[PDB]
Design a binder for this molecule. Sequence first.
Ligand SMILES: COc1ncc(C[n+]2csc(CCOP(=O)(O)OP(=O)(O)O)c2C)c(N)n1
Ligand SMILES: COc1ncc(C[n+]2csc(CCOP(=O)(O)OP(=O)(O)O)c2C)c(N)n1
Ligand SMILES: [Ca+2]
Ligand SMILES: [Ca+2]
Lengths: 667, 664
Amino acid sequence: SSRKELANAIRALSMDAVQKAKSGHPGAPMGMADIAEVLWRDFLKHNPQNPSWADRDRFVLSNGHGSMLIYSLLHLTGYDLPMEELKNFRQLHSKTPGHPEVGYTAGVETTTGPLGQGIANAVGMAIAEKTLAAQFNRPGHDIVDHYTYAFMGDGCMMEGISHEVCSLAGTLKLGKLIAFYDDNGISIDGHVEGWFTDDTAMRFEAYGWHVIRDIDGHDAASIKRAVEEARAVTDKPSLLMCKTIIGFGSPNKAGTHDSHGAPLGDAEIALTREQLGWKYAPFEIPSEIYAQWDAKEAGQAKESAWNEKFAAYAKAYPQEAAEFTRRMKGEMPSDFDAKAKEFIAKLQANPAKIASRKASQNAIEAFGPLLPEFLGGSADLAPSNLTLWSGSKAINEDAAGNYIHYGVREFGMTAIANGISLHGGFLPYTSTFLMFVEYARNAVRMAALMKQRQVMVYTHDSIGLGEDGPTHQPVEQVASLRVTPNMSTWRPCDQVESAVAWKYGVERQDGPTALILSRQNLAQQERTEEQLANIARGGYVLKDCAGQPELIFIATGSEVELAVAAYEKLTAEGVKARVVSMPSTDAFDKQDAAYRESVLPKAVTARVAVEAGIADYWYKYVGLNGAIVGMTTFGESAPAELLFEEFGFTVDNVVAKAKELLHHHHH
Amino acid sequence: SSRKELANAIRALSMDAVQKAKSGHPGAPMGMADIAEVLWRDFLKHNPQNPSWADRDRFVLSNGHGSMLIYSLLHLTGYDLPMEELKNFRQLHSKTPGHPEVGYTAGVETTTGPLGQGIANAVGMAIAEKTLAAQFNRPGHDIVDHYTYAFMGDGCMMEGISHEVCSLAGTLKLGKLIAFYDDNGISIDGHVEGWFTDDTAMRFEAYGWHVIRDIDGHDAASIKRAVEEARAVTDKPSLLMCKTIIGFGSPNKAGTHDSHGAPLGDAEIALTREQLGWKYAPFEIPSEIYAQWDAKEAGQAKESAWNEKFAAYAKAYPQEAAEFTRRMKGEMPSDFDAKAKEFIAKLQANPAKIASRKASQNAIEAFGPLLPEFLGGSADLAPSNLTLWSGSKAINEDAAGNYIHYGVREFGMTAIANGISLHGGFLPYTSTFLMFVEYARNAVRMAALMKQRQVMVYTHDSIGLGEDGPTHQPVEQVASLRVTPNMSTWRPCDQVESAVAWKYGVERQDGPTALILSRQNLAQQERTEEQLANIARGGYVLKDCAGQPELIFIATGSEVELAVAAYEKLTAEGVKARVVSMPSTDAFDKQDAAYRESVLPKAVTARVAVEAGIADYWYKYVGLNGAIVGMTTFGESAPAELLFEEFGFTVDNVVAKAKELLHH
Ligand SMILES: COc1ncc(C[n+]2csc(CCOP(=O)(O)OP(=O)(O)O)c2C)c(N)n1
Ligand SMILES: COc1ncc(C[n+]2csc(CCOP(=O)(O)OP(=O)(O)O)c2C)c(N)n1
Ligand SMILES: [Ca+2]
Ligand SMILES: [Ca+2]
C-alpha cells in the first residue's frame, strides 16, 4: 500500500468510531494521520508486546480530543487494543474513553485533553530521560536513550502553560523532545486569525527551540525529512510546524470548524471514503494493511537488543542496574520504612518548635540519602519553601542532579512533574506558596485522576504568613484540595506530624500528597507510642478525658496548639473535653467506621473545629450543633500575631465559643 | 533637583518604609525608580485630586511586591496618602498594605502581587479604553483618549498568563498599552539564567508588539526617548526592555537576590544613602523635591480641560453623554429591574425544557438591548457555551463592538475581564466549560477579593455532559466556588432560575457571579408567585407538605427534577416530604433567619441533598443526621444517561436513601 493508504486506515477507523459513538472528534485524527504514519512507522521505538519497556520512546497526544488517532495507532501497530474496543469508543468501561487515559489502554502514556497539559507532560518525560541517562549511563553502556514525541494543536499553543513548559525546555536544551504542531488554522470559534496571530515559529525560536517551518503535513516525504532533521539536532528541542487540513478527506467539512468535534455524518463519511479511495467497511482492515502497520516483530527486536545491553550493564555495574530496576518499577528501598520510622521516633523524643516548612526541609534532608529517585523543585521559591537539602544538585548545573529550578511557572511545574512521575525512575516533589496551588490547580487534579505519586510542598499556609496580605494568605485552598477525589492533603501540627506526612506521601503509590506547611513555628505535642502510630490514621485523639467528653475540639496544623490550650483551660474548670488532631481528613475518612467512631463518637455533638481556613468545610465533622473557629473572609496585611488576634484565633475566644456552645446545648 | 535626586526620593522612602516595617521588598522599587520618575513626571496624565477621573491614564504595577514604588509615587505626586501611612507600611488597617489593593489607597488601580495578573489587568484596561473610544468618540469630540502603562518583572514574564494576554493584545493592536520590563537578571532563586533564558524581545515581536531593546533603565534620557518612541507607535502595544540593577544604590546588595524581599538592614541603608548622596533622614522629603514631584496643579488643569471637552460633547450628543456617565459610574439602567422581572415572569408562564446553557443565551439576548455596557466573550467556546446573542459584535471585527473571542486562554480571559471591570464603562462576562475554571482559578478569586462585577458563564457542569469523560466532568469545582469569600454561585434548575441568576449577577455591585449551567435539557418547574419571587433568595420551598415536614430534599440544577420525582413517590406513600431548590447557597445564607427557618426548619434533621457534584459540601445543610446523593469520585466516559444511572442519580436510589434515613 502507499503511505497515504496506510494513513487513511487511521482516518477510516477514526471517522467510523466517532460515528458509531455519535460523539467525538474526527477532525484532528484525520488532519494528523499522515504525520502519525511517518512518525510511528519510520521512527518510533516501541514494543506493542511490552508497553512498559523502560527505554521505549514516549508519545504524547496533547490535543487529546483527537483520541481516535492514538486508539487507531495502538490498534494498527499491534497493542492489546482489539477492534471491539474501538467499536466501544466513548462507552462505559471501554478501553477507548473520549479523551485518552493512562491505565485504561495499553500504550497510552498519560491522560490528556485539558489543553496544554500534554506538552507539559512531554517536557517532564524528556527531563526524566535526560536526567536518568546522566545518572545511569556509563562508558560503553548507554542504557537510557529515547525520544519524547508530542502532538499539539492551536489550543495547546494558546494556553499559557505552553509558554511555561516550552520556555523551560529551551533552557534545559532538551534535544530529544520533538513536538509536532497541527497548524490547521481552525479552532472551535472558527478561523483562528480572529484571536490567534502569533508568529509561532519566532516565539519558539525565542525559547531556544529548533523550528522547522512550513512542512506539508500531508506529504510523507516532507514529514520524514523534517523528523530526520529534528533528530539530528541534539542541543535544542524541536518544533515541526505541520500545515494540515482539519478533517482531511471530507469534501464538505475538511478545513472547517464543523469537523472539529462532532460526527461527520453517514452521508459525509460515504463521500469521504470516495475522496480518499478507502473501500473497506467500518471497522474492516485487510490483512495486508495490518502487515504493514504491525510493529510486533521490529519492537521485539529492538527490546531484545536493549535487554542484551542491560544485561551487559548489569554485569559491569550490578548495584546500578539493581537501582535502575527498582526505580523504574517505582519500588521503595527495602530499609526505607524502618529508617523513616526511626527518624519519626527520634523527632517525637526530641521536641523542636519549628515551622512545618522547616520540618519539611528536615524530612527531605533525612530522606534524601535514601531516595536517590527524588527529582524535586520549587517555582522560584527554594529559600522560602525550603526545598533544598545538602545533597540537592540542580539539573541545569549538572544533568545527573536531582533538583529543578522551575522558575515562576507553577502550572507548568506541576504538569511537568506529572510527566516525570509517568515516565518512571523518579519520585517528583514540587513546591510553591499554598495560594498559588490555584495557578496549578488542574494539574494537581490531573495527578489525582492519573493516580500518580508526587509530593506537593505548599508552604505559607494561612494568615500566619503575615504582612504579604490577602492575595497571598490562603483561606479556602485547603478545603478545595480536601474535596478532590483521590487527593491526599496533610496539614501537620508539628515536626512529627510533618515527617509522618512526608513518609505517607513518598510511600503513596496511587495518588499525590499535598503538604500544607506553616511559615511560623509550631509547638510539638506530647504523644504516647499509640498516638505516634495514630498520626498516619489521619485523625486521632491527642488529649482526652475519662468518660464521654462533653466537648470535642477538632484542630489541624498551627491551630492544634490553640485547641490544646483551650482544652487545658476548660479541663482545669472541670469540663470533660477531648482534642482530636486531624492532619489528614482524607486518611481519616479511609479508616473504618469503628476507628472513626472511637475518635468522633456519634453521641458527642458539641464539637468545635479550630482552623485558620474557611469555616464552611468543617460542617462535615462538626455537624449543625457545634461551632467553628475559622476564617469567613479574606485576610489582611499585618503582622501575623495581630491577624490571629483579630480573626479570633486566641485562647480566650476559643474558650468563649466552646462555653457558648455548651450553654446552648444545656439550655 | 536633578532627575536622579527626584528618583532617589523613591529609593529612600522605599528602603526606609521596608526597614521600619521589618518586612517587604526594597529591590524592585530601587531598581525601577528612574523609570518611574520619567514616566510619572513627564508622561502620565492623572489628577491626584480625583483618582476616579474617567479619562486618566491607568498605571499598573504587575510586579506588585514592589508596593513601596507605587506608594512613594502616590505620596510624592500629591494623592491623599500621607507620610504617616508610609510609616505604617504593612501594618494593620493601613492604607499601605504589603501588596497594593484597589479601594485601600487613593490612586491604586488594581490589586496586584500574584504574578502575571497585573499585566493581564492592564491588557483589559487597554481593551476597555479602545472599545469605549470606538463606542463614544465622535468627530471633533474625542472624549476617550488615554494610555495604559504597566511595570512587570521576570516573574510576570515567566508566568503563562503573560503569554495569553500579550498574545491577545498583539492581535487586538492595543497601541496605547505600553509595558516596561524590569530586566534585572534576578529572581528569588538567584541569577535567572539557570531557569529563564528566553529572548523576551523576540517573543514579544512574535506577538506583534513593538519592542525597544537595550534601554538603560538608570538613564533618564534613554528612558524618555524610549517612551516617546512607544507613544508614537499607534498600531501595536509596546514593550520597553529596561536593563536595571535590583536594589540600585546599595553597595553590597544591589544586583543580588538578597535585595528582593527583605529589609536591607540599617548599616546597608546608611551605605546606600552615602552611595546615592541622599542626605535626608527617614521620612524626610524637602520642599523642593515635593514641588517638582507634585502633580496637583497640572492634573487639575488637565482634568478641567477634559470636563470642558465632555460638556461640549454632551451638548452635541446628549443621550450618548448620559450613557457615558451612567456606564462609567457602574449604574444600571433605571428600568432594567422592571424589564428583567417582566422577562422572568414570561418565562415562568411559558414553560420550556432547554439546557441552562441555552437559557443563559436567552437571558443574554433579553438583556443585550438593555445593557450596552456588556463586553462579553468565551475562551474559544462560543458555539458550546452559547455566549453570542443577535447583537454580538466581535471587537476584532468592529472596535465599537461588545464581544471578545478570547481564544484558548481561560486564565488570561478572566484577568483581562478583571481589568475591564476595574476600568469602568463595561460589564464583562466570560465563559468556558466549568472544569476549566481551574485554569483561571486565582483570577476568579481576585475578582471576588477586588469586589468586581463580572458574570462567569460556566457550562457543561457535571457528568451530564457525557462522553468527554472525567477530565471534563466537574465534580468538586462548584464546592470550591461556594466557599470562596464574596463569590456568588448559581446552579439554576430551569430557564426561569437561569434568568433570575443572570439578573442577580448583573445587578451585583460588589463582586462576581458564577453561573453553573448544563449541557443537557432541564425541565421547567411550576411556581406560585411567591416561589417565583423567592428564587432570588437562593433557596426556597419548591414542593411542600401540610404541616412540619418529615423529610426535606435539597437539590440544585439538573438534579431538582430527580428530587421532585422522589418527592412524588414518597408523598404518594404518605410521607410529609418537601423539596427545596437551592440555586444559590450564598444568596440563601444572606437571608434573614426567619426565611431560612421557613425553608430548612431546624427541627427537621431528615435532610437529603441531591447534586451531581462532590458530596462533602452538603454537610453544611444536612449535618450529621442526613443523607447526600452526590459524587465521591471522578466521572467516566459514557453517555450521560448511563452515567447518571452508574453514579446513583436515579429515583430508586434517591428514594432508597431517603427511606434508609427515615428508618434511622
Ligand atoms: C482549558 O483546557 C481546555 N479548554 C477547552 C477545551 C475544549 N477544546 C478542545 S480543542 C479546543 C480548541 C481548539 O483546539 P485545537 O487543538 O486547535 O483543535 P483541532 O484543530 O480540532 O484539533 C477546545 C476549546 C479543552 N479540551 N481543554
Ligand atoms: C504565582 O504567583 C506568584 N508566585 C509567587 C510569588 C512570590 N514572588 C514574588 S516576586 C517572585 C519572583 C521574582 O519576580 P521579579 O518580578 O523578578 O522580582 P524582582 O526582580 O525582585 O522585582 C516570586 C516568586 C508571587 N508574588 N506570585
Ligand atoms: Ca486547530
Ligand atoms: Ca527580576
